[PDB]
Design an enzyme around this catalytic site. Sequence first.
Site, PDB file in Angstrom:
ATOM      1  N   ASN A  11      16.554  32.124  96.612  1.00 22.12           N
ATOM      2  CA  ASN A  11      17.592  32.414  95.617  1.00 22.12           C
ATOM      3  C   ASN A  11      16.890  32.884  94.355  1.00 22.12           C
ATOM      4  OD1 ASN A  11      19.315  31.321  97.495  1.00 22.12           O
ATOM      5  ND2 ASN A  11      19.731  29.466  96.328  1.00 22.12           N
TER       6      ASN A  11
ATOM      7  N   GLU B 137      20.607  34.209  97.833  1.00 22.83           N
ATOM      8  CA  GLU B 137      21.380  34.406  96.608  1.00 22.83           C
ATOM      9  C   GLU B 137      20.682  35.358  95.646  1.00 22.83           C
ATOM     10  OE1 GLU B 137      22.199  30.802  94.512  1.00 22.83           O
ATOM     11  OE2 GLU B 137      23.231  29.817  96.159  1.00 22.83           O
TER      12      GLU B 137
ATOM     13  N   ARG C  13      27.534  33.407 103.984  1.00 17.66           N
ATOM     14  CA  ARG C  13      26.922  32.121 103.767  1.00 17.66           C
ATOM     15  C   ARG C  13      27.894  31.257 102.989  1.00 17.66           C
ATOM     16  NH1 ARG C  13      23.165  28.998 100.468  1.00 17.66           N
ATOM     17  NH2 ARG C  13      23.412  30.538  98.800  1.00 17.66           N
TER      18      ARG C  13
ATOM     19  N   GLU D 279      18.800  24.945  97.042  1.00 17.84           N
ATOM     20  CA  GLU D 279      18.224  24.735  95.720  1.00 17.84           C
ATOM     21  C   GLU D 279      17.789  23.329  95.393  1.00 17.84           C
ATOM     22  OE1 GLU D 279      20.891  26.649  92.905  1.00 17.84           O
ATOM     23  OE2 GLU D 279      20.116  28.585  93.573  1.00 17.84           O
TER      24      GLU D 279
ATOM     25  N   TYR E  55      17.251  35.068  90.543  1.00 13.24           N
ATOM     26  CA  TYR E  55      18.132  35.614  89.511  1.00 13.24           C
ATOM     27  C   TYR E  55      17.404  36.247  88.339  1.00 13.24           C
ATOM     28  CZ  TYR E  55      21.906  33.150  91.828  1.00 13.24           C
ATOM     29  OH  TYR E  55      22.841  32.687  92.709  1.00 13.24           O
TER      30      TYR E  55
ATOM     31  N   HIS F 126      25.257  21.633  99.674  1.00 11.97           N
ATOM     32  CA  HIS F 126      25.323  22.419  98.464  1.00 11.97           C
ATOM     33  C   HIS F 126      25.850  21.591  97.300  1.00 11.97           C
ATOM     34  CE1 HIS F 126      25.282  25.743  95.755  1.00 11.97           C
ATOM     35  NE2 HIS F 126      25.095  26.651  96.700  1.00 11.97           N
TER      36      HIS F 126
END
Lengths: 447, 447, 447, 447
Positions: free
Chosen positions: D293, D351, D76, D165, D295, D120
């Site tokens: 995504n 991600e 990606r 995002e 985290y 992005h």
Amino acid sequence: TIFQFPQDFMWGTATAAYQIEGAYQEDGRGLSIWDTFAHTPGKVFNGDNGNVACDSYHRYEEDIRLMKELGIRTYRFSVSWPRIFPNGDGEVNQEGLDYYHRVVDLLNDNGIEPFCTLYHWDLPQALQDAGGWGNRRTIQAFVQFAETMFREFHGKIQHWLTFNEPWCIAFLSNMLGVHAPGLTNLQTAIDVGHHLLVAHGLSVRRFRELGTSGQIGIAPNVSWAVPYSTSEEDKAACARTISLHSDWFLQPIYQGSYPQFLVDWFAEQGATVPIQDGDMDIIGEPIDMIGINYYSMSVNRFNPEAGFLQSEEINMGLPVTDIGWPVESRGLYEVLHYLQKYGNIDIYITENGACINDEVVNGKVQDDRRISYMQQHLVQVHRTIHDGLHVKGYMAWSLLDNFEWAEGYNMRFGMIHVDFRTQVRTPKESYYWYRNVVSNNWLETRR
Amino acid sequence: TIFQFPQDFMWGTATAAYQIEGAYQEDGRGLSIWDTFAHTPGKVFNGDNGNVACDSYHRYEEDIRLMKELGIRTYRFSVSWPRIFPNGDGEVNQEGLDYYHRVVDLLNDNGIEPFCTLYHWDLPQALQDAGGWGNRRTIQAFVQFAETMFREFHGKIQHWLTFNEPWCIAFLSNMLGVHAPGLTNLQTAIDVGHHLLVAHGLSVRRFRELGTSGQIGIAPNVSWAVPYSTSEEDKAACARTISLHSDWFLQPIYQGSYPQFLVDWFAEQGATVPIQDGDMDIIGEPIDMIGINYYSMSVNRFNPEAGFLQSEEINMGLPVTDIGWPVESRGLYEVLHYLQKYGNIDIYITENGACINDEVVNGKVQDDRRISYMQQHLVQVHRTIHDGLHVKGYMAWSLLDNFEWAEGYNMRFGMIHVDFRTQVRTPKESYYWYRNVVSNNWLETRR
Amino acid sequence: TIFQFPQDFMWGTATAAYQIEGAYQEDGRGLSIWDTFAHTPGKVFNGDNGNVACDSYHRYEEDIRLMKELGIRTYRFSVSWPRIFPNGDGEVNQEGLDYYHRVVDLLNDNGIEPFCTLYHWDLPQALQDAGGWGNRRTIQAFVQFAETMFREFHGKIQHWLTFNEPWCIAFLSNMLGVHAPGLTNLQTAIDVGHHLLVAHGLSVRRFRELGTSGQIGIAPNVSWAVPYSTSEEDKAACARTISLHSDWFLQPIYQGSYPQFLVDWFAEQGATVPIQDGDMDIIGEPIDMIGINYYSMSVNRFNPEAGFLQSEEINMGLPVTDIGWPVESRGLYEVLHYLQKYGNIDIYITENGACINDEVVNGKVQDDRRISYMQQHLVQVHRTIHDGLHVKGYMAWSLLDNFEWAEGYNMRFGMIHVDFRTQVRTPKESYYWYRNVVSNNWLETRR
Amino acid sequence: TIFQFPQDFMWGTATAAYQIEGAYQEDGRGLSIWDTFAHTPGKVFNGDNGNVACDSYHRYEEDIRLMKELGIRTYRFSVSWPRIFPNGDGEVNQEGLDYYHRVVDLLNDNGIEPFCTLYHWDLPQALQDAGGWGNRRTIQAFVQFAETMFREFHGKIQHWLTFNEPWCIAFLSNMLGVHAPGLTNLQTAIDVGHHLLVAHGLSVRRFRELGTSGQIGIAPNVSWAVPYSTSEEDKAACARTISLHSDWFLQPIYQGSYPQFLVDWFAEQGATVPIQDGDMDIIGEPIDMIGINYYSMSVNRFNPEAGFLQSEEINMGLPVTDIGWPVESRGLYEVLHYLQKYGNIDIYITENGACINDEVVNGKVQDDRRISYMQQHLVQVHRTIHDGLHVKGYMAWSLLDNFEWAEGYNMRFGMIHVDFRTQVRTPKESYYWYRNVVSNNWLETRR
């Protein structure tokens, strides 16, 4: 694997007087052939000597406290002859006897059984002046010494040994000249060997006649050699190497005779055993048990240039201890089975240990190699016990690092480290490991 | 000690195809039971596999240059069956043959004698689908494979081995399930063992009929166990442990029969050898020599709970390699003498090495323990040669660190370090040490 | 974040008698099932045992001084039954009572409130000989023990616990055989569980009847499992895992019955609870509070092969303590809310800690991971308090490193390091950190 | 535990153009709002910027070789808008398109499927000058950009994402001012959020109308918050935290409306969404899948002073990554189940990674903590797959260490270390670990 030991198995440690006691001129102690030897330039590494050693003459209480924490059952120690009879022949030195009374009483108070070794190489110099073990008068001097101890320590000691390592006392000391008195004469070595055997026999008689308490024996250092090739000559070479250490002293004791092949071997070299009528009968005095001292094993081959026994030791590439001895424990198993030729007699491993020179780092002595060495050997002990042999106990060679004879203080064999600068004792990691084995009465090998 | 070796002694190193070649799908290679096994979760440590390994499929030239610098005389390698016959039965894959022609020609160009191992565990998956070694059709597939190689590499190879480690191929793989195909069935293990023996016999016949160049034999992995106690039961346990590895495959080959005590042992477990008329005669085909693979030795005792052989291995406290095997070289001496029961046959130590995991530090791999291990074993080799046994050569197990079967890349046996991240080769200290021994043709043990 | 705790929050540390007292044969102490267990080869790691442990039998004063410096409010300790009733049934050993009077008086003198745990696994061997907890006579032996203590320490102790970790006492010890007495029988585990509950109920009655001072409860070790999948089977597996530790002992106590699903579960395995008329009523005796012991949490799935509860624990990849337990504090929050099914009862976290093996380096023990573990758990405690739950106190598991049951001395849980070679105490960095939290009565998490 | 993944599971890594391409003025690239932002004192740590970054504009071939060795299936990457349309509105820069053709062709040549992220964060500065995303003209500029790419890379790319995002693009960038353009205005953040949604909808239409190859979706960064207390206010605080990241962008897309509670929340703050007739219908354009995504996860409580969402994050004491984020993987499991509110849609973890700053020591980067982090998260992925959710793939966040936006080069997220001084790539230990997981298609957690 888990190795459970017998309920009454005797666990201990051992020392020798000149190696640990450090008061060579104190309380009227006379000089021994070892004081003399060590005081001679070139005899002992770096001129080290036992003048001070571990100062166990003064520090015995601390040592005994330490061995009490170890959970040990017996303590094998030797008596300094020149402390009892400074001259070897004269009058008794009560101060000398008192020291050993302080030690023995303390051991007994602590539930530790004394295992007394009468002779551990410290022959009074005076007697050596008259010829030492080469002179039969020394045999009488020794019996007087033995009697004195038997009577003085009657109900206090229950295990006695006359001599410790006759092979070293006779051949290493008088033929190879490596140990005091440092002579290099075959006949002299043979005379010494024969006279100590007579002395031994007589002392057992006295032990019996006086009705002294306990059991008594002798503790030869044992050798074990395996042939490199299948040749009869290599096989013979190993027979000589093995037999001189044990058979040469045990056959007379148990079978009334010296190993003929060795008798013939030495005859070819012009030496003959000075046997008087009645001698062999005296030597054959029934003993209660023997002590066995084992450290290594070798692979030998016949070699006409390889010393008086013409037995060459092959360097097989095996890892060695810090003193250079390869570790191969099977040898203990092999020799114990071999000794069955004298019957399933009571045997105590009076000495087994290794020279691992680790020092104190971050407050401890990480002697993993000593733990390793010991583990391998204790397995062999369990093994023989399970083969039905009467192996009664094991004594770790050296409670303390000490004066290692010709090596000086340069080679450490102890489970408790001693800083000779401060006299400070630091129990090594092997000590704590051993405390566990002897207290649990079982050993475990793990990956 | 200095150990001089015979003028014509053959020095070498060894590898196996699936362990080092890294091009599992390249040039039409079909899958082997090992690709399958390693590709199964839980079979090999960390899911490692031989997809890339040392990439010796592409890096053979560098490896050969390195082994040329080693001063070695022969190189033992295995042939990947599924590279030659991707299906196991179908048509020949010329690409596969070409690879080995590139390798063999290069070796020959460099004066290194190829020592060809036809079967080193990589059975084409297709055949396993049809039953593998449990199905006699596989015997035919193998003979076709052998012929192809015999004819293809006629005057290029002079040393051949049919199977490498029949014990692992049959029992470890089919009874214990540790190696591919990972089965756990006694009868299946016995079927495999019997069919590989028939395959072996037939292939030697073809070798003879085709008049192929060189000598041919088989290379069993050897075990050696010594009894803990003197009991007949412990003695029997060791006999089972020893005999299944060697006697079970060598007695049929040399004496026309299987070890009866083992035959009776398995019969009690409900398994019987699937012997057809003519089989034993085929298996007894005269062979030129055998290869012997030795690594360790054990002390065993009878234990009814200790696996199908009821032989328990005692942890004697001995130091072990990084894979956990104790090092005791006498075992090599013992087994070589034991094998004399088949006559003083030509024997090559086709494998001997140790798992020492040292990595590159400051540009070198300080594998002192590998040098130590090797020294001790080479001494035993010289010893047997001097006892008159016909031990013809020694091949260090693993030229390169590799895919250690079930251990994955986690266990290093090589003399040349391979960083599997970069494929970079770094000859270890043992390499330079070996270069000296093989070039001088003599070894020296020093303190 | 700053976490302020309640004004009267009770901060403490905890120990168990057999884990720290080191005088197993002193002052007439009789053997417990744990002395027996540890003295058995293969039961405890390395054959370690509690013969000496931390020697807190002799060093209690130093420990109490140390915990006085910690600024702690209470100290939870257990009473050694075989010290009070060496036989378990016979006459009182006044020496045993005296020891605990010395301890309790000292604590009281130092303003530290004793938190007495009557039973912490050390059942007198004599009673085990008669069947132990499987025999109802033991219930009576226990009540006598409880009464003796209630009467002897009347106005000296204000917090009492009957049993500590019934799940370990019953199932880990009698079903899984990991803890003394080491049995592996479902019905036996159930009998033990039931009899300890009856013993508990009766002892509370006596507490009430004698008008003894303080409050009394029981301290089950708590488990918490979360399902891997959303399946009803995984959900059921977690219910079994959770309920056996707590509900199995708390439902009888609070709701007069055993968890039916677990009753049915064990019935399928052929075991049934030995309930006599009147038993459940006795067990339901009102208690003042409960102690909760929490260490970890797991993610489980149903697996028919996963033990008697068929609940498999998934290795989620989470970081673990040195004993292998993953740290996830949410579990404490989850279980405390779960326990609200019995009402908003008074709960004391009687144990919470981690095995972090750091040793003394440069004069300190840098146990940052213990500080980390504790911080995360104390946050959960504050959280529940703020959700309105009556969590009354927190006791750090292990004031001192100790004999960790089957792990031996190999696993350290203490805030104060103990060198078992010297018995020297060295408060760890977690100690000083804790001294701050308990003294400030508030905690702070910072980046 | 062994976690087997689906046969067609898509494994990959990911990067963003401005973070890795290092030729900001090369081949006619126009400036982006990020060039502008980083070039402003005080905006990015140490004044770092993406002028050179990893120089992937020139080093793409090496990177692609490295990711080919990783055994990865997709890659990606994002497209630099100002490279295609330097002005944002003007004519196409063929040089820009050529670069991406070189990259995509190379990927395709290597059997790696391109996963194209159109936006992005690198909005051409020119458009920002005209108001950027706050101006609807930008929506048209974007659609032109999208079309250009759809037509240019038609049969070369099969996976597309419009925006990456949206929460960071809108709120972090325009409300919190942490990311370019660095504004701090609620209404502005809302305008940006709304216009990017319209832009997204329109671009999908074009994708459909042009009949472009592959599937297309959007990749929101996901948040997950759990309440500290059981209070409705804490519960609401977490709802706001969770919903703004995902629901605020996904509800319009899937359900044709914005989260009302959030609409009301912002209305109270004086902001309203600039919705024109037809907008919501455009935004609701059916998408093929979404990228997620993830985290971290947090424990929040309501706090009126805690920013515009009045949701305070509690520091629970959990261990954090080098950028300060606590690792708690359950959050991934929780959010994936939560997202089922939109149906069991296809989800790709676009991600997932951690900031672990280990550098090259002795030739390697020992990033054990990255391996740990990844293992825990991959377990959660397998878990959801087994709960029946359509999680289709996983892309490790950051193939290379890169320009971490406001953190500069100070925070490393890559599996391949980049020394920004030399541009040298050194695959970390996590790389080799990942190569194994993606190649085996199964993961194993071990103690």
